[PDB]
């Protein structure tokens with residue numbers, strides 16, 4: 115099959131773009147949470163302040179809850195870069211005019227960020243600083259209200275998502291499909307993207323068949339997860355607008371600013 | 377430091393197909409290539425279109441207007457590859473790479489036009505033909521109004537006699553201009569811009585020894601270039617506002633918007 119041909123490869127390429135650009139994979143991550151060092155479990159002020167100073171590891175320290183909030187922003191900023199590189203590592207993506215690539219990453223980065231978060235997280239916590247730390251959900255659950263409410267949803271979806279058992283090759287394609295989404299606000303060359311999206315999804319469709327043989331309704335579930343990811347980022351942007359209103363004191367990083375404006 | 381000037385010169389040479397080099401030679405009636413077929417009426421332009429040298433052909437003046445667009449579309453394409461070809465530039469987050477390109481391209485397109493023009497006409501289609509300023513003016517006012525201001529600038533700029541090496545450094549100083557509206561990270565840009573300008577200067581003393589007052593002149597041409605585009609946009613908007621029948625490429629739409 116002429117299609118099945120250029121696709122298995124197109125799949126591999128993206129997978130080779132994922133592996134070259136993300137500092138953390140579910141492969142590496144999953145090992146840490148199961149089978150070197152025992153990541154310093156952060157669960158309170160001491161562990162936090164400890165991990166901070168030098169044990170494990172930025173705006174003027176104001177408070178633990180705001181400090182964590184900031185530590186969640188940096189994460190996003192560093193991820194958006196790897197996601198630009200990953201996007202660029204797709205020849206049909208790079209061809210697009212610079213402005214179209216911005217609109218994609220702008221409205222796409224968080225959908226992709228909430229899917230990759232699931233990789234470095236288990237029902238009890240997430241991996242920080244190249245998996246050398248482990249922030250406990252219980253600690254994160256105890257942060258100040260305004261900021262403690264954005265942390266939970268991310269967890270609820272991460273577990274319901276991680277049950278599909280997707281490895282790094284599925285995610286390579288999954289993330290590409292999230293970035294190249296024609297239905298993006300103010301996109302220009304829409305048909306070109308919609309077209310690039312179909313190749314990715316078809317490649318993703320073939321790939322799930324080989325990689326997850328006797329599996330079930332996996333593909334349609336991921337399209338749903340993609341839809342759930344659209345809604346999660348929405349429920350998120352909303353909480354962020356309230357943080358910029360009520361938390362008159364806490365700051366927002368430049369890149370997170372321009373991402374939310376309109 | 378020259379590692380910067382060599383880097384930008386090789387970024388400029390590799391990226392833009394028509395350097396002042398090839399172009400300037402092809403106008404000095406030289407021998408290493410071939411004669412350029414002149415275009416002055418509708419018969420020559422059609423011939424060019426035929427073989428010797430895109431929306432539904434509406435009219436004379438509009439067909440040219442369209443050719444102007446598809447020309448700045450491939451210039452913006454080489455200009456993007458160029459800008460990225462400056463490592464210090466690429467580091468920047470995609471969003472700012474665009475803002476610099478959104479307000480810089482036209483300033484940089486008009487400077488390079490002068491590179492391929494002269495009081496009589498300009499080279500079109502890879503120096504394969506030669507459109508005349510005469511034929512250019514003759515087009516209906518809602519089009520001839522944008523073409524001439526560029527010719528006046530063109531000649532009143534080639535009088536400085538730069539060479540590809542300078543331009544490489546001129547176009548870079550225009551692209552990276554932290555005075556662009558909505559730049560997320562102004563300081564990181566104002567820093568790169570300074571390096572290029574300092575780099576430029578050192579290169580102008582060596583490359584244009586006797587050039588009395590060169591470097592300060594260019595910065596002035598830089599300002600004039602913002603002046604030209606600013607006025608160029610005004611007209612374009614006015615056309616988009618009048619010639620409803622006339623289609624404007626989506627990319628030229630995004631650039632102008634808000635200007």
Ligand SMILES: CCCCOc1ccc(C[C@H](CC)C(=O)O)cc1CNC(=O)c1ccc(C(F)(F)F)cc1F
Nearest residue numbers: 182185186187189190231235240242249264265268269
């Ligand atoms: C895995 C589920 C956890 C939810 O994680 C989230 C949720 C929302 C966001 C939103 C960010 C900024 C608030 C964004 O909107 O871009 C970031 C993280 C990512 N946060 C971190 O990576 C993180 C990083 C450092 C710390 C620590 F150690 F400082 F406590 C705690 C953290 F949750």
Ligand SMILES: CCCCOc1ccc(C[C@H](CC)C(=O)O)cc1CNC(=O)c1ccc(C(F)(F)F)cc1F
Nearest residue numbers: 440443444445447448489493498500507522523526527
């Ligand atoms: C060098 C001085 C000439 C002035 O050229 C100009 C002036 C303004 C613009 C503005 C363009 C679109 C209107 C833009 O704003 O991006 C483009 C050109 C570029 N035009 C062309 O490249 C061009 C291309 C083809 C033809 C023709 F006659 F052969 F069809 C005529 C042309 F001026």
Ligand SMILES: CCCCCCCO[C@@H]1O[C@H](CO)[C@@H](O)[C@H](O)[C@H]1O
Nearest residue numbers: 198216219220372373375470471474
């Ligand atoms: C790779 C990360 C990219 C993050 C991009 C964030 C883009 O924000 C948008 O940048 C545009 C210019 O490019 C502006 O015109 C929009 O008003 C602004 O909302």
Ligand SMILES: CCCCCCCO[C@@H]1O[C@H](CO)[C@@H](O)[C@H](O)[C@H]1O
Nearest residue numbers: 212213216217456477478630631633
């Ligand atoms: C390399 C050529 C780049 C041309 C870029 C033209 C960009 O236009 C701007 O694109 C932004 C999204 O990216 C929008 O948010 C702004 O409203 C719009 O004005």
